[PDB]
Paper text:
E. coli clinical isolates express the FimH adhesin, which consists of a mannose-specific lectin domain connected via a pilin domain to the tip of type 1 pili. The FimH lectin binds specifically to mannose moieties displayed on glycoproteins at the luminal surface of epithelial cells. Mannose binds in a deep and polar pocket at the N-terminal end of FimH, in which the amino acids Phe1, Asn46, Asp47, Asp54, Gln133, Asn135, Asp140 and Phe142 create a dense network of 12 hydrogen bonds with each hydroxyl group of the pyran­ose ring except that at the α-anomeric position of mannose. The interaction of the aglycones with the tyrosine gate formed by two tyrosines (Tyr48 and Tyr137) at the entrance to the FimH binding site contributes significantly to their affinity, for example with a 400-fold increase for HM compared with α-d-manno­pyranoside.
The Y137A mutation, on the other hand, is the most detrimental to FimH affinity and specificity: (i) in the absence of ligand the FimH C-terminal residue Thr158 intrudes into the mannose-binding pocket and (ii) ethylenediaminetetraacetic acid interacts strongly with Glu50, Thr53 and Asn136, in spite of multiple dialysis and purification steps. The ligand-free state of Y137A FimH permits the C-terminal carboxylate of a neighbouring molecule to enter its mannose-binding pocket. The Val155-Val156-Pro157-Thr158 peptide of the FimH lectin domain from an adjacent symmetry-related lectin domain makes a significant intrusion where the oligomannoside glycan is normally bound. In addition, an EDTA buffer molecule is bound in different alternate conformations into a cavity on the FimH surface. Remarkably, EDTA was only contained in the extraction buffer of FimH extraction from the E. coli periplasm, but remained bound during purification and dialysis steps, which did not contain EDTA (see also §2). The EDTA binding site is very close to the mannose-binding pocket and the two sites are coupled by residue Ile52. The Ile52-mediated connection might be needed in WT FimH for proper guidance of the ligand to its binding site. Ile52 is also the residue directly linking the protein-intruded mannose-binding site inside the Y137A mutant FimH, with the EDTA binding site formed by Asn136, Thr53 and Glu50 at the protein surface. The Y137A mutant structure allows the binding of a macromolecule other than mannose in the FimH mannose-binding pocket to be observed for the first time and moreover exposes a hitherto undiscovered adjacent binding pocket on the FimH surface. In the ligand-free state of Y137A FimH, several of the binding-site residues (including Asn136, Tyr137 and Tyr48) already sample backbone dihedral angles that are normally only found in wild-type FimH upon binding of the mannose. In the crystals of the Y137A mutant, a breakdown of the binding site with a severe loss of specificity is observed.
Author numbering: 1 to 158
The structure:
Amino acid sequence: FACKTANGTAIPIGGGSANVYVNLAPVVNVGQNLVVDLSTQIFCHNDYPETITDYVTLQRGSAYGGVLSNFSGTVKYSGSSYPFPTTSETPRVVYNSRTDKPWPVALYLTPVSSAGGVAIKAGSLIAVLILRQTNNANSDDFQFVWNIYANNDVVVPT
Ligand SMILES: O=C(O)CN(CCN(CC(=O)O)CC(=O)O)CC(=O)O
């Protein structure tokens, strides 16, 4: 089991970490959601699908910088919604193919009442998402750590 980002950075068997640089909507009004869809940026595959089933969770998601200060969050994982920053590990998603498939994570971020101006600075760390990978054969328990960085400013107009 291994993962890759949309620009080709890999995390190999056994886990590791990588940076993910994401374009964000440059403006988000009070009452609207800023969507950070990681499913178009993070992909994973099972190397030996005839031999083993791999299981994948969002073990935890943390917010940083302007996301932590200026937004109220939820994370959708494989169709279900949870608080973001997270308070529990999600259910497991099955990976059963050598073809890379999306990691089905999206953040829904709406401005807090105090947000105004540049609410996320371009280049800043906005999130760390920990993917936990297990399997149905042995006790392997691997962490794939995704450090999410903003490519551009996000403005909340005032
Ligand atoms: O997980 C696999 O793909 C192969 N499994 C078999 C698990 N299968 C049972 C079966 O194929 O009859 C679970 C499944 O139904 O996918 C071997 C193992 O026990 O580690």
